[PDB]
Design a protein around this ligand. Sequence first.
Ligand SMILES: O=C1N[C@@H](Cc2ccc(O)cc2)C(=O)N2CCC[C@@H]12
Ligand SMILES: O=C1N[C@@H](Cc2ccc(O)cc2)C(=O)N2CCC[C@@H]12
Ligand SMILES: O=C1N[C@@H](Cc2ccc(O)cc2)C(=O)N2CCC[C@@H]12
Ligand SMILES: O=C1N[C@@H](Cc2ccc(O)cc2)C(=O)N2CCC[C@@H]12
Ligand SMILES: O=C1N[C@@H](Cc2ccc(O)cc2)C(=O)N2CCC[C@@H]12
Ligand SMILES: O=C1N[C@@H](Cc2ccc(O)cc2)C(=O)N2CCC[C@@H]12
Ligand SMILES: O=C1N[C@@H](Cc2ccc(O)cc2)C(=O)N2CCC[C@@H]12
Lengths: 497, 496
Amino acid sequence: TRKAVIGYYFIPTNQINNYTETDTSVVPFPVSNITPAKAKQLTHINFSFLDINSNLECAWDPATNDAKARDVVNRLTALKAHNPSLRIMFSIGGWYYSNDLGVSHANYVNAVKTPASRAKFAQSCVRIMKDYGFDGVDIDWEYPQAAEVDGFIAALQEIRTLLNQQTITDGRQALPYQLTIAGAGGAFFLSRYYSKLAQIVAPLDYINLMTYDLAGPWEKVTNHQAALFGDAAGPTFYNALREANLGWSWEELTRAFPSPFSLTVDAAVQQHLMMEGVPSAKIVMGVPFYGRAFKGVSGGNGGQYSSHSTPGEDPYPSTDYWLVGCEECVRDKDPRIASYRQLEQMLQGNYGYQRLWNDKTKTPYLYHAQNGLFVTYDDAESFKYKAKYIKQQQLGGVMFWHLGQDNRNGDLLAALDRYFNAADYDDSQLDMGTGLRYTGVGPGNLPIMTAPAYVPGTTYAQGALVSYQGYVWQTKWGYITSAPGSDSAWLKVGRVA
Amino acid sequence: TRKAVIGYYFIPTNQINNYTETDTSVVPFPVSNITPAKAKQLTHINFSFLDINSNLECAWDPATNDAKARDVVNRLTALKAHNPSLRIMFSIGGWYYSNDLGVSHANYVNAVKTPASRAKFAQSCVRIMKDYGFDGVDIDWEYPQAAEVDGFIAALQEIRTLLNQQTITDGRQALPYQLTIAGAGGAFFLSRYYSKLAQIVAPLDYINLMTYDLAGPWEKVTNHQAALFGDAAGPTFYNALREANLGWSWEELTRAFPSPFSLTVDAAVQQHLMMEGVPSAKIVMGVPFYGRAFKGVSGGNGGQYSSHSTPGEDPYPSTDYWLVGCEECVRDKDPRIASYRQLEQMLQGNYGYQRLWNDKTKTPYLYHAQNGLFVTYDDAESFKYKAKYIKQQQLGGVMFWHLGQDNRNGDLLAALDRYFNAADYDDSQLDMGTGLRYTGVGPGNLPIMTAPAYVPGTTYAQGALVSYQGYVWQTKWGYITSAPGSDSAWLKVGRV
Ligand SMILES: O=C1N[C@@H](Cc2ccc(O)cc2)C(=O)N2CCC[C@@H]12
Ligand SMILES: O=C1N[C@@H](Cc2ccc(O)cc2)C(=O)N2CCC[C@@H]12
Ligand SMILES: O=C1N[C@@H](Cc2ccc(O)cc2)C(=O)N2CCC[C@@H]12
Ligand SMILES: O=C1N[C@@H](Cc2ccc(O)cc2)C(=O)N2CCC[C@@H]12
Ligand SMILES: O=C1N[C@@H](Cc2ccc(O)cc2)C(=O)N2CCC[C@@H]12
Ligand SMILES: O=C1N[C@@H](Cc2ccc(O)cc2)C(=O)N2CCC[C@@H]12
Ligand SMILES: O=C1N[C@@H](Cc2ccc(O)cc2)C(=O)N2CCC[C@@H]12
């Protein structure tokens, strides 16, 4: 099965309103930069972003020139002429609209509350999808929590119902409408809905994990934002999942959630796989086409794991664009984020950057020894490891933010497509390294085990293993006269074949 | 409020059937041994044991001569003439009838199963209570398992309703019929129903914790069976409560259930107090009027924390009564348990025993250097610390097993009564020692704290403290934009 390659196409309202394909000062990345070759390398383009308005309906930013919006979407859908598998999805939400402190957050929370609000919202998603010619719905609510999850799940199920009927109504069996969401790629936000992952993913074609932004100026120690595996020399984090409302015992929580742990892509993927009912085929690994930068870093380890003096505030609080040679940073008024395209130019221009590689995390980084700068990002090399991981772990594919950040040659996207589909690319011998793997085991993903059937009336000693009602259980203390599962003395440690 | 002093009066069926108050060889502890003085020192006598039969009703052992049983019970209730506050409770169950592998275990499981079985069972308890003249019902099922807990709770609620009705019908406002249970005093059995402690205790006047038997020949290292506080040099145990079906987070489980921990009386009491809805006034601390002995122990620490060669089987699988000087052990064919009465006589018989004191656990122990014997027991001295603890922790009182094991002068019972009620006893400066205290903290025993009100819309850094819905909460990580109780990033750490 072909691996998904889901690229975001993000275009701000002002750019849609002033859309032009011949003025990069107005529209840096027009749809025309998505060439037929690039179109063929993609399976999905997530057009972003639509939002949920106060009427609790999926809607374009009210300030959008609708005609221009249609034209931009048309340009993307026309790309399907180059690739019959391509879907132009549209994404609702995103960090700015939907984070807790985002302007539209209330609308996401309220839209999913009742059968009526969910029906109204779901219908609007499909209406928007059909009206503009999109091929599916992607929701990027970052992130529902608490009592919002059940409503969110129901809204997803509703949209799913509507999309499946729409596929029939339109005779779209050859390219059915799809439903996806951007999911957290780090334990902190993931903990908000982790316990219900199975229900959330059930109605989805894919859950695209934001397995990046795992480091940034909001953290006191510089680090790789998307390490595939962990570097023991790097910072570790509190495993927030152990605090999720799972109802598991101390032993189960401990087995599943080692803490502190290495905040890596592997950790997020394995954390999803520890949950029963979450198919690897639906998990899409997100990768960033941009780097995050810090200033004030110390030397010695190329800027890695150092204190720094980078403001973490959003928006960037100053006018000091200190990322040497980053012109797009000036444009976006923030020296803390830079497209791979821009980083590559910085590397090519005598700006003082040194490209280094961490072979544990399998990710690159730039170190500016002169001005004490550190940039964590991904490139075609880190993508080899991530692509092999995607194939080895049987994940659904890769997602990335965003198309305009690839270099002009579209090397990152070409690299992803190559690693998955090129007959002449062979990563069979690519060494995945000795970086730290996430080793948690969830009661939902226990290994197959074999043990003598439990015998009622038997008094078991501590450490005894028995098979019973589909699982192999182990006693946690002795003089056990209870049947496994009937009390607290037994721990499910394996599945019976 | 006067502290409860609940003493078990245990009489096996054959003794009831051959009841006599003038021949110790037949009935070692007849009711007449409970003098007016002892009757006044007790607030409750738990007559034991009745059982739950296959008809799923509370009932006497089928072999019991009912006429003699009525007579024994009447002698006990006649004791109320000496103490207007005295209640003669009857206990249903006990270890042998009700433990998982006990003869009547299934009847307990089955009796609490349905509304109809609970109703029938509840009715039978009250009927038995009224027919024989008891003052309350005590149930000693050791112990309902997770799946049987809801039924057990419902049965207790049903008995509570019937007793409260009976109290009104009998004009017993001055001495209401009561309902109590013997509760586990160790984390392992406690873990079976721990998560629903509040529901279990709600219908009870008291939960009598069997805060003893925390050591025995069933364990590989000798230890005190009822240490008040812990001795770091003593064994420690897995804290089974962290595996109870509480639904708590890892931080909550961890802060409540340090593991391993010292299996002590203090631990059991604090574990109950950590549960919200469990009032200290209903918690009764059990104390043993007997000791447990081990053989094959090494010297060095007076027999404490030593490997041993004591059989763990029940009943004792041999006729070798190696507890030197223990005649009662011969009478009972088991050298691993000796009444305080017998131990006292063993100590003053020059049988080679030394009485030692562990000042951390605040409990005495006997060491027989010549034969390598170790005995853990309680006496009037250990009761000082326990009584002070009961007062300090505002517990309901004390329970003990069993009256027949106190010495003839009833010193253990007199001591307990003295420590709680004597005008001339002053334990204000009693040194509670430096033994290990159980430090777990749970929902029911959160410290009083203050913190700025939580403000929706605010982003909190890691470690931030706020008050919300009457509790003080702390963030476990940073950039917290959600509210305490809606976000798993908050830990309830204090109240008010
Ligand atoms: O505001 C920004 N927005 C992001 C882009 C973005 C837009 C919406 C969204 O939900 C998530 C990301 C950016 O590139 N930036 C560059 C600097 C400012 C910063
Ligand atoms: O929400 C998103 N956020 C970006 C990441 C981001 C966030 C803030 C910022 O200033 C710059 C970049 C992303 O990767 N995405 C993929 C999913 C939608 C979109
Ligand atoms: O794989 C899927 N397929 C659809 C089912 C489907 C199949 C063919 C068709 O023409 C239209 C709809 C679904 O319900 N899904 C639920 C989640 C996965 C997703
Ligand atoms: O002998 C015991 N044995 C120990 C341990 C035990 C429990 C159950 C079992 O089936 C066998 C052993 C006990 O808890 N006890 C409670 C009172 C008797 C004392
Ligand atoms: O079998 C025993 N029975 C206990 C007494 C007992 C009876 C019932 C009950 O539920 C709990 C305890 C005893 O003193 N023992 C002395 C030696 C034998 C041993
Ligand atoms: O079940 C119980 N068991 C005894 C303890 C015991 C158990 C076995 C043994 O052989 C000797 C003593 C007790 O203290 N109890 C107080 C509650 C009822 C009664
Ligand atoms: O700037 C960031 N700040 C961090 C941390 C954060 C979270 C919530 C909040 O309200 C403020 C800060 C983050 O999660 N990010 C997600 C994308 C932007 C990036």
